[PDB]
Write a protein that binds this DNA or RNA. Sequence first.
DNA 1: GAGACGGGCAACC
DNA 2: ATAACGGTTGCCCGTCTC
Length: 993
Amino acid sequence: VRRLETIVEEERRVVVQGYVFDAEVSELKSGRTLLTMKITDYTNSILVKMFSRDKEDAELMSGVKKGMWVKVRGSVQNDTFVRDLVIIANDLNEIAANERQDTAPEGEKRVELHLHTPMSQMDAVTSVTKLIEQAKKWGHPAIAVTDHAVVQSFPEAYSAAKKHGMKVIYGLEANIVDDPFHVTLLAQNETGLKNLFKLVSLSHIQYFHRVPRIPRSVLVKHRDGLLVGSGCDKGELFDNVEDIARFYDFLEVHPPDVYKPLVKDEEMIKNIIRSIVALGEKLDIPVVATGNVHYLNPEDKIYRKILIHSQGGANPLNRHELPDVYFRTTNEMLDCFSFLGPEKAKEIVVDNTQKIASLIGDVKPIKDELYTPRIEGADEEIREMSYRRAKEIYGDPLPKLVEERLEKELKSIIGHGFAVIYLISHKLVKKSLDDGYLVGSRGSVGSSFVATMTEITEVNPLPPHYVCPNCKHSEFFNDGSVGSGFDLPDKNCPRCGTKYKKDGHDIPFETFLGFKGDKVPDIDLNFSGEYQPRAHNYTKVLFGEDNVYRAGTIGTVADKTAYGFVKAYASDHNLELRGAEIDRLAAGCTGVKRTTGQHPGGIIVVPDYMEIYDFTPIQYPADDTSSEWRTTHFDFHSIHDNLLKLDILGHDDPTVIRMLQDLSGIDPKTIPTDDPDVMGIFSSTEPLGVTPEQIMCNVGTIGIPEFGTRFVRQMLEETRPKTFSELVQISGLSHGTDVWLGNAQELIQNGTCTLSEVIGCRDDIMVYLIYRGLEPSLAFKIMESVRKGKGLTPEFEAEMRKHDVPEWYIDSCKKIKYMFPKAHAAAYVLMAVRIAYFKVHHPLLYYASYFTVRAEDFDLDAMIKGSAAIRKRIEEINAKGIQATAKEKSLLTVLEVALEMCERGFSFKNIDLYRSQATEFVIDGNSLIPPFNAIPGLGTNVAQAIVRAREEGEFLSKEDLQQRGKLSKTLLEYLESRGCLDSLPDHNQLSLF
DNA sequence: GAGACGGGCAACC
DNA sequence: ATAACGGTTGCCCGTCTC
Ligand SMILES: Nc1nc2c(ncn2[C@H]2C[C@H](O)[C@@H](COP(=O)(O)OP(=O)(O)OP(=O)(O)O)O2)c(=O)[nH]1
Ligand SMILES: [Mn+2]
Ligand SMILES: [Mn+2]
Ligand SMILES: [Mn+2]
Ligand SMILES: [Zn+2]
């Protein structure tokens, strides 16, 4: 039975063992089945192949799963396609994992009080879940989490705690300075927990030096509910007579192996530990044998070695070798300390360890309920705001329909505590417009007519209808025959004679708040990217400085980074590893925390009767002490259910269409949603006056948000939508894995249902299930499950069958990995059609706005040369297929629209010293003049400088241009070589003040 | 050795 | 071409320059 690291050449016959971390099965022309596994025994890894000799073995083959352990007998061969050695197995048997066992008697078990999770930045490696589970298996009555300077594992620890019925001790290894050493803080109770959240806050904010730290006095102020331990060899006392020590509730000692970095010798460690045993007995302080865990098993050590190594000589823990700091069993812990004799061993490994655990109560680090803000007037204001606005549109008294929608909507929004955020959202939007920036609608608030009446969304969710902007007469349609009011033919009010308005997308309110009202949604707004910061800052003014926080993110190592680390470590160490072994080393590094950052726009709101520390510590993103905002230490996900979020997001749509308006004078609200020439671009190139061959595309949506994509254009080719609601159906199925491909598309092509019967937004699932007779709350629960790609539970299936839901519909729900709410789809389409209006009727305005706002990757020389030059660049990139770099893909996207622009008759001029702007493509006759910042290397800063300079006074020489325009040599040549500078002398033979 | 700039990556909607 | 979810903010780190 051979260890994998000893498999080095081709060989007729080996027996080998390992954890299978990947396994796929496939059929061969012959009818034979092939099993392809990757296994590791943790000394190395290897790919295993097996060829079935009968259908019995073939299906057994399908039973081999990730997580099994397997013994394989077979031959070692060079596989020339996979480019590695590989086992061809003739024999396979599942075996027990037979893992490290904890052999001490029940109730006589150890407790781990000093332990690191992957949240100890780049420093520990085994998830807190695995660790907690291992503890349960071993029978430990408790386990502590004590990450460096942070508590970012608390949320996962709690979950695992509840799942596994394990008692977790919520801790912190902190940096203390005297007014820089390690102490262990264990929280006994909620007072202690809150103090931890406070400490981690102050250490990251008021007291961050090069590292978060806590002055000892600040610790004392916040000590209540904490037990304090002396911790590592980087601890205060280990680093040396007695007063220092009496400061602690328990005294830490690590297995001698842990201290092996060396002090003078190995005998000194053994004595020092004794000097600490002596100290603790003398002072009646419990002495505890803690392990300083950084990973589960002894061999998991390599993953840590790889991470740390990635940080260069800029770490100085690469100086010496790394200690064995895996999770030690109670019996093996006794062994490490046998040298103190059997009574002390048992005292400090178990009795005291258990005793400390027993001084710890049952703490819940994350709350169960939602805390909702209060601001006087809010409930009442939202009520009057919406009844008044509705009445002025729909008349007094209101139509029954409208009236019932308000009554039902308001009692829910108010009762579940959402009126405040509706109102704040209204104010955010209103300030943005006053400030000159329109706002794009988004997300599920559009399901709410109250949201519509409060101008928090442009989406009107009522059934399709006509309303008169004059006399205000209505006509609604519930036949369900009409998809959205936007599809209606223009029509005049059969009363006052005046031209009808059309609206209503028939969206159920419950997509937003559900039925119990026990879901916690947010409100999503698309502010322009230019403006987003300002909307953020306005919430400080509205709620008060200390009642909002930007959601913080935790940046972990994912696949691409892990592979990078592993390869570089291989390279540096002169290892040639098999593919399979690179994979598994990579997989061992993922999940480890690397940085912190900022949620892309969510502001978390603290009710005035609570405080942030009831929920999470706070800090600076990436520890930037100059940052304008403080972030939550926990991410939004961890506290999703406790506090409302305002998704104040950034987006190009609002900026693009704002510029389209500032350039044309046209009010985008007056743009028609059934202009045949505009809607034609969603299925043809006719409206654009160009040939498909001319622009390398069969439909007219190049550059249109969402619809200009290659995947989506193809969908459009085969679905040919003309209608607003048909476009809405496409929006829905063009977003999310397994919605269209291998699902809806197959269903239409099969004949099993029509394009309009396929599941195209999460709302349709709910509405259909209600129709089919299921209980609305359950129909809602099922909708929410599938749109998060959680599939269906056995109960859901049973309820569905019981009510005659066809087997294809059930199966289609199980596939969907993600899905829009209709209100998002309608918002986005509305925006897409407005822009389209410009693409058709004001082409050059459309392109100026495109290249100014959306584009960041250019081939200017190609673009200037024109059609043929662009086409050639495009073909160069097409040739690389899916092996194109993101950057090539970003480029391709913009070139596609450039070529279209040229074909439509327009063109690009060279950079122009006196007409080029800083960041905006300007219109000149039938051309765009590119801005300075389009030049590779020339960022926004210089661009603006060049413009500022020339406004101060013309350039008098290439040299004058160079100095006052702050241009590097390289960029000066860029302009030079293109003839931009020909009209100027190199330098001036005179200069005056 | 400080600061602009862009690529590559991760988180999130 | 194949298969294909689209679009946004933000952080780190290497490169090039003055
Ligand atoms: N294309 C795409 N769009 C997304 C994705 N996730 C979210 N969005 C867009 C569509 C969503 O309606 C909106 C996301 O906002 P949220 O995360 O707040 O979800 P939503 O509002 O749909 O549900 P909620 O009522 O808040 O639970 O932004 C995604 O994975 N792909
Ligand atoms: Mn330490
Ligand atoms: Mn430690
Ligand atoms: Mn939302
Ligand atoms: Zn009328």
